[PDB]
Model the fold of this input.
Amino acid sequence: PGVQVETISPGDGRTFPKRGQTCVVHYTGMLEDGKKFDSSRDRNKPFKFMLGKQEGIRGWEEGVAQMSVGQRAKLTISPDYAYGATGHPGIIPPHATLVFDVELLKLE
Ligand SMILES: CCO/N=C1/C[C@@H]([C@H](C)C[C@@H]2CC[C@@H](O)[C@H](OC)C2)OC(=O)[C@@H]2CCCCN2C(=O)C(=O)[C@]2(O)O[C@@H](CC[C@H]2C)C[C@H](OC)/C(C)=C/C=C/C=C/[C@@H](C)C[C@@H](C)C(=O)[C@H](OC)[C@H](O)/C(C)=C/[C@H]1C
Done:
């Protein structure tokens, strides 16, 4: 409900990120039925982060944790699992549902 994870291409079905593990991903984020606000693909540089230890929005952490290595997935994140009633001023409006197209490339 807070985050829906829908497969674009399956992963290995077996290797999922552990809390504290470094995840290497490509992503594109857009406002649902609106504008693209960020893409690591457009920078040709994958995004690395430590799941849990480097805190992200709830739907990102819980959505990526549900993915296995190699998986590409559409994450639809409700505002309560994203930036909420305040949004992220200047970038994400109040009460925004977010879509991320995420590909889990590697776990380090
Ligand atoms: C994963 C963890 O990494 N996330 C990050 C940002 C995250 C969100 C802003 C964080 C707050 C934390 C507090 C909670 O209260 C807030 O709740 C409302 C959420 O962003 C996201 O969660 C999502 C999902 C991942 C891709 C980016 N993202 C977006 O929405 C965007 O696409 C956006 O364009 O990203 C961009 C921002 C705007 C979004 C719409 C991302 C931004 O660019 C230039 C980048 C890459 C910034 C990097 C900062 C690094 C700083 C370090 C010193 C330390 C760092 C590792 C930490 O440890 C921090 O702690 C102490 C914290 O951990 C941070 C800042 C992690 C970064 C890597």
